[PDB]
């Protein structure tokens, strides 16, 4: 690569586990981020700056004042402007040497499928159970990893699902499809909490793409209130509508 | 608190643990963020969007290409501009309704003690063992809570030291980095500030360590050193 790119990616390249090799891998890698909010926003911000070759940002909503408290990528001046655009645009100003696509739609059906297909890794950053479900289905089908997370109030939840599908899919831990019983406090959310969650979704994407020994198949839980971390093991359904 | 304000802070206000009581508290607080790097950058960003009344951005340095990989608050286009200025400007675009004071200088001795005094919580975001040491001194002198962090390669470190100074100060205790690893640490530094300024209970007498490769946290029990030169 370049002698400049070296400087920019200096902090990663200088790392044994990544070095020049991985750094190229990152540059040759592609990542799909469905949803650019308090979760996908810092996810995209850190991936671009890390040098992920390609980034597809999908989000069908505009920038609202209500967002600025946790969706750090945006600015008040961006209000009413479509997220995907504003996003790609600002990420560009950060890392021009990388390609950024902006889908101003809702990824579904085949539009979501092939989109998933390509991607070497797919981050789910839609705090939506339905979407998350088909993103999972699609991911399982076109054997492409899914790194899903979420947050409500002071609580965070993260999960990495690799293609081998060892410990099953999201439709294993929740063969259902409706909603969880955390539907109560679904009122607000602390920025740092949803933030740390997305940021971690990116660390997991890097490690996955740069082929690092990152444990998966867990369900990490964060309690922003007690500032305590916790992990629940996983194992697939003895006959899931997927992963079967 | 008008229509606009209710709207931006709405996801925080609709929270039992904060509501108008806390949102109001945040808006009356001042936080000193010393250092605007991989740590300070996301911290300032999350605190501002949160609505902390006054933010003092300290940092005697300019943007560099190297930076852009972990310091998410800057772009290539600010490459030679000073950070405190660039931060101050970008943060205002996010929340014009809060007090944002830049500090293109380098705090030390008195210049530091003043800033620490006029500040509810101080965030040590200077990955420099030295500045760090002076701050811990100032923070204990003016019994001002100190949230400090670190992040090297794949491992981060976090600590919340408060006034009763029960389990020690930073003395009582004592070059590549992954983007997200410093981030997590910084974002968490904000989380602790918001919990401290809003009044939420937070076990703090420990040294949280994060290993971003194995993806697991560990803690060490702090202890105020016998005859510590500050405690
Ligand atoms: Zn399954
Ligand atoms: Zn001490």
From Swiss-Prot, chain A:
It is an enzyme of class 2 (transferase). GO terms for biological process: thiamine biosynthetic process; thiamine diphosphate biosynthetic process; thiazole biosynthetic process. SUPFAM superfamilies: Activating enzymes of the ubiquitin-like proteins. Keywords: ATP-binding, Metal-binding, Nucleotide-binding, Nucleotidyltransferase, Thiamine biosynthesis, Thioester bond, Transferase, Zinc. The active site is at residue 184. Binds 1 zinc ion per subunit. Zn(2+) binds at residues 169, 172, 240, 243. Its cofactor is Zn(2+). One of its GO terms (molecular function) is nucleotidyltransferase activity. It comes from the Bacteria. It catalyses: [ThiS sulfur-carrier protein]-C-terminal Gly-Gly + ATP + H(+) = [ThiS sulfur-carrier protein]-C-terminal Gly-Gly-AMP + diphosphate. There is a cross-link at residue 184 (Glycyl cysteine dithioester (Cys-Gly) (interchain with G-Cter in ThiS)). GO terms for cellular component: adenylyltransferase complex; cytoplasm; cytosol; sulfurtransferase complex. Belongs to the HesA/MoeB/ThiF family. Homodimer. This is Sulfur carrier protein ThiS adenylyltransferase.
